[PDB]
Design a protein around this ligand. Structure first.
Ligand SMILES: Cn1cc2cc(/N=c3\[nH]c(=O)n(-c4cncc(O[C@H]5CCOC5)c4)c(=O)n3Cc3cc(F)c(F)cc3F)c(Cl)cc2n1
Ligand SMILES: Cn1cc2cc(/N=c3\[nH]c(=O)n(-c4cncc(O[C@H]5CCOC5)c4)c(=O)n3Cc3cc(F)c(F)cc3F)c(Cl)cc2n1
Lengths: 302, 302
């Protein structure tokens, strides 16, 4: 037992990370087969970063303007192209460490692992969720641009996030691997603000099930509630509405614990209206909303 | 910016994980050069697990009794030996993925990454600290025996923990890679209890510095305190005593933020005596003690 914020093992992604430099601008890239993927922002000089026209900037470049370093090896660029906010640099060598992989876009409330990298060198791995306002509460320093987020299903790395930038509130914004931003953001060094965020209700419930599986039961109660009378109370506290599909997704956890979903909702209603009275759940003093039903099952059952 | 529980990238360790089977008993091993390291508990049958005499059990075995699987390859055991609670299985093939590595024993309050593995297959990575009572609050299921904890310094993996078992309270116990247990535990399937734990004070202070670096300042105050009048108040709340060496270790964070260590201690004293009044620090509603001064610097400065 026990419950941690667990990331996927990151080795399959580490063997893909490279450094990309254009001029004095540098950041991380992702090398899969004979293509290197990276934020197109790398073709911006310091004075270009404020208000770039990327089509203009890219036509003024050739392959020899891009320096790609894979460890101690320089990869020669033999082709370049833009796809939305990602640059694709064709190289003359296919990555021998390419894993089976997929480019998938994720939904708010889903989780993924991040491999934070600097100058093409992996430095750390952590688990994050995509918030309702399409930001993530990441941990990143200067140089982290191009770090990727991913999930692993069996042997296949599903890449879902490429990091681009930090917003003024300190949260992080980026794109899927086809270069399409998550949320209403653009890749220019201007102040941009995220919309309002909500608590991911289904995840909180999933985490309450995790707690029960691990012997934390103090928040349970004999009451029950209706799906509508719960949402009426959850909106008040800035929680996403619960749907019948969320209850279905929570089915398996309901079974393993024998606690009907709507019953667990009753406990959540009480926790929101009374607080925790100085107690904790799974070692935390607030309600955690960055574990999905699937993450719970993976860690608490097998 | 931002602050997460970050693990080291785990690839260098993933390429070392194997499965070891003796009879119907199976668990994880660590393959470095031509040796596989694993808990000696693997030579126990179900009825041996309660009260084993390992010297007896091992003399009754030969090399052919040990099945080592590295992915789809079986490694032939050509030698076996015991070192304290670890079995060393000599194999006829050196691991081509062996990283530079060291066996180091860590201290209570230090942190490390865990690669949780099942049947020799890595499943997840998380960051943990060694508690004052020499347990860790891990996340592990059946089959996780032999998973390793480690730190990476540059290119060198310092292995510090091999997982052995879960205690009745749900916390986890194991050994260093020389087979010496952390804490007063033994590798037999009997109920054993950990001693009392304390909060790792220097880490809490390190984390308060992280919070300041990230713009969380509400807990600060103009007061200061003396090292002795802080400890007098911290003991009351089950905190480790602070030493002059802890203040020195916290020096760099003191400098980067301009907040004298004893001043930050003043804020901690106040938080312990008043609580947090429904506010949070770095997204948490309680004081976090599993980040060391070094982890903070690594994530908050570079
Ligand atoms: C020499 N050189 C200089 C370069 C500067 C660059 N710019 C960024 N580098 C970067 O790392 N971070 C960043 C991400 N996460 C956390 C962060 O935390 C820091 C900040 C406060 O705390 C610690 C920072 C950014 O935000 N940017 C801006 C930015 C990047 C984009 F891709 C974009 F489309 C629009 C932008 F506005 C790049 Cl990409 C390459 C460079 N080479
Ligand atoms: C067929 N087979 C059967 C086997 C059984 C085995 N025994 C253990 N396997 C194991 O995984 N965990 C465990 C660790 N962490 C978290 C855990 O969580 C579970 C428990 C509740 O929640 C989910 C469990 C253990 O505690 N043990 C006991 C144990 C192991 C030792 F090394 C020891 F020295 C003394 C012991 F008392 C082994 Cl090692 C190999 C086997 N092959």
């Amino acid at each position: 037992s026990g419950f941690r914020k667990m990331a996927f093992p990151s080795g399959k992604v580490e063997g893909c990370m490279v450094q990309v430099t254009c001029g004095t601008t540098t950041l991380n890239g992702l090398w899969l087969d004979d293509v290197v993927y990276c934020p197109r922002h790398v073709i911006c000089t310091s004075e270009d970063m404020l208000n770039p026209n990327y089509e203009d900037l890219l036509i003024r470049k050739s392959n020899h303007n891009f320096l790609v370093q894979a460890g101690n090896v320089q990869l020669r660029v033999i082709g370049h192209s833009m796809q939305n906010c990602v640059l694709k640099l064709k190289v003359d060598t296919a990555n021998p460490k390419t894993p089976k992989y997929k480019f998938v876009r994720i939904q708010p409330g889903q989780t993924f692992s991040v491999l934070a990298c600097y100058n093409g060198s992996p430095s750390g791995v952590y688990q994050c969720a995509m918030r309702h306002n399409f930001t993530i509460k990441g941990s990143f320093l200067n140089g982290s641009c191009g770090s990727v987020g991913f999930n692993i299903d069996y042997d296949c790395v599903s890449f879902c996030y490429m990091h681009h930038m930090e917003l003024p509130t300190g949260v992080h914004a980026g794109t899927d691997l086809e270069g399409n931003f998550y949320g209403p953001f653009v890749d220019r060094q201007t102040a941009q603000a995220a919309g309002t965020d909500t608590t991911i209700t289904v995840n909180v419930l999933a985490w309450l099930y995790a707690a029960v599986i691990n012997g934390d039961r103090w928040f349970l109660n004999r009451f029950t509630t209706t799906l509508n009378d719960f949402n009426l109370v959850a909106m008040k506290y800035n929680y996403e509405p619960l749907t019948q599909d969320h209850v279905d997704i929570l089915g398996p956890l309901s079974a393993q614990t024998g606690i009907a979903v709507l019953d667990m909702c009753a406990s959540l209603k009480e926790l929101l209206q009374n607080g925790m009275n100085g107690r904790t759940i799974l070692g935390s003093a607030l309600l955690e909303d960055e574990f999905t039903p699937f993450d719970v099952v993976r860690q608490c059952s097998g």
